[PDB]
Amino acid sequence: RKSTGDNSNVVTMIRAGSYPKVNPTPTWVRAIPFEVSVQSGIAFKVPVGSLFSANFRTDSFTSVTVMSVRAWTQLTPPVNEYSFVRLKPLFKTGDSTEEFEGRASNINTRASVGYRIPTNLRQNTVAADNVCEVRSNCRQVALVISCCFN
């Protein structure tokens, strides 16, 4: 039968009022997953521009406030080795020297690690800027960046 309260099955009028405040191009909190190629014994600078793309619905943005960064190895490690990945946060005001590392305990398993950016270091970064250096015995690294597009 379905209820009649009221009635919940047909269009109903909305007693709107004054025109509100609008914004066609609002912000957007997201977790952007993407991968990068990494060489052995060399750090790779993760460019912020990768966060802007139609593949994420974010190419309408030009700046992004990074909150946290997480990385997983995306390919198998060398023979006899265990996957490992490292993150060195970068900042326009001053690059860091931390090497947040994670090593797999099962060769067949990924190695993972992340780092949170404190509030006092949460600013906008443009495509030209770099998020962090990535090091890994695996040739590709899977990244998942929590950030705020604006």
Which residues within the stretch 90-109 sit at the binding site for a second copy (CB under 8 A)? 91-109
> Does 131 help bind a second copy (rule: CB under 8 A)?
no
Of a second copy, Mg ion, none, which one sits near residue 41, judging by CB under 5 to 8 A according to partner kind? Answer: none
> Does 47 help bind a second copy (rule: CB under 8 A)?
no
Structural contact between residues 123 and 136, judged by C-beta atoms closer than 8 angstroms: no
Contact with a second copy (CB under 8 A): which of 44, 45, 47, 68? 68
Window 53 to 72, contacts with Mg ion (CB under 5 A)? none
User: Which pair of tokens denotes residue 134?
Assistant: 């990535």
Sign of the C-alpha dihedral computed for residues 137, 142, 145 and 150 taken in this order: positive
Of Mg ion, a second copy, none, which one sits near residue 83, judging by CB under 5 to 8 A according to partner kind? Answer: Mg ion
**Shortest distance, position 44 Cβ to a second copy, whole Å:** 18
> Does 88 help bind Mg ion (rule: CB under 5 A)?
no
The Cβ-side half-sphere exposure at 8, using a 13 Å CA radius, reads 6
> Does 40 help bind a second copy (rule: CB under 8 A)?
no
> Does 77 help bind Mg ion (rule: CB under 5 A)?
yes
CA–CA separation, 105 and 115 (whole Å): 20
> Does 134 help bind Mg ion (rule: CB under 5 A)?
no
CA–CA separation, 110 and 42 (whole Å): 19
Task: Compute how many other C-beta atoms are within 10 angstroms of the C-beta atom of residue 115.
Answer: 15
